[PDB]
Symmetry: C3
Subunit: 184 residues, 3 copies
Amino acid sequence: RRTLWTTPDTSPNCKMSTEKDSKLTLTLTKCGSQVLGNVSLLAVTGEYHQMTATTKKDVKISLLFDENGILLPSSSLSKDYWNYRSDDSIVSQKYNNAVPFMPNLTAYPKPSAQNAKNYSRTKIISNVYLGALTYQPVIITIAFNQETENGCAYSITFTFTWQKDYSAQQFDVTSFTFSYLTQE
Amino acid sequence: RRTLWTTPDTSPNCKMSTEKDSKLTLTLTKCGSQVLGNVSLLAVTGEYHQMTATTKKDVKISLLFDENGILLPSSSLSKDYWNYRSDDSIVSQKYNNAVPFMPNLTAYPKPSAQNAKNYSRTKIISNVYLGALTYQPVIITIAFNQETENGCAYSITFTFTWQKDYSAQQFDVTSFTFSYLTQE
Amino acid sequence: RRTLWTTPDTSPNCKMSTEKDSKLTLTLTKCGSQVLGNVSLLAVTGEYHQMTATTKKDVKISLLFDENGILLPSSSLSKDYWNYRSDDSIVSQKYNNAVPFMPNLTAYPKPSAQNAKNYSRTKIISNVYLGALTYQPVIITIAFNQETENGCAYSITFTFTWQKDYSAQQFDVTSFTFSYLTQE
């Protein structure tokens, strides 16, 4: 089937600062040569749930995948409810291949001295909005296959970076739609 | 079938200020777990057709749906040419179910005291450009299931908000692409 | 089949300043009534490969199509590896119809005195980022069917416009996702 997701609930599944302090809402829908992606992030507990003036204004969420397209346990996202869509939950089989959802390695090559440059097309950069307030931009950077750690074959990372003072607020951002070229 | 739309003509179908003063161009294409959406708005007559310094720089277009996914008459958009695509028009049958196009109620829950917070993932916020001029940003806010009026089961609203002085101009904005998680 | 693309390699295929000085990475995936598009641009040689203070901060890439949806040779993009996807390359047949990928002429009409206005929905305007650096915005303007030259039936153009001083840098931008309504 054609969607991988986190499920649309708010049960923590992700690490911003500490384990399971946040809900990453992520849906990847296969549309032939592209995945149509939709992402947002909410801090449920911990530092980012009530930011201070010193909370770091740069948060990277890493999804690392093996050569079958299966999420590695060293990822920021828990494997437990990351799987193919079944109703508003996931399917019962834990380890189904997902190479057709992975970012294309020719479009988005791994980091290496062999590369002529750091290719900018490996990233998407835009703004989302903290608290859905229009005066509170947060830069979202989505990067494809730019991780090498833990033997990963593919990667998708979501970085949130900002400069405005959002102390006393709960980290939560508007949803962001994107696409990327796939492997097969 | 797989697209709901307004039709791509310029015949007024929407209220910005007064009835049928504007054309909302909206296309919703079902891509499995997500709808791929594309929207723009044009004022054809009335206040927004030739703005003054006092015309309100905040315009909300509300699409309210019943539990079958069918547009309610209290919406800003007229029901008349909102339907499934047939060529560059719509199909002749007026009342076909559209639940698979509706925004997912777990991802995007209705407003209630039962909610732990106002969840930011219920909105998309970005900029479009008035007159397709790069120095004339307009904030677009798309909100999912955040209306309760008139017994609606689901909602999609498009708000356009700005601060720059666009007096003497005709309200018209660039197109905006987005996606959202669906109900089934 | 359902994707037209440039191929995801970095072999020059496009003119920014001089012939074949750049790689346009473009993928168009048919999703019913819409195409899901993904674009980026890299200067490989020539002026934009190492910009000066006087290099023009406005670059238009024009894709002109005939009535079959086939790219015209007067386009900025070379015909040679613009075709339907086959693995990470293109199919061997050179001249397959692509009308279902073309921008809808009712949504996006050609320029004419017959038009009531220049319709803003014919464009998408947003920011991408030079070098994938968050402080280096570049405006991307995508325009549909706004060219008339060389007898074209349809057009898609990508303009990159900026004001910041990016001298000494190599032109390269983050990827951008978009959609548009199609002809059939």
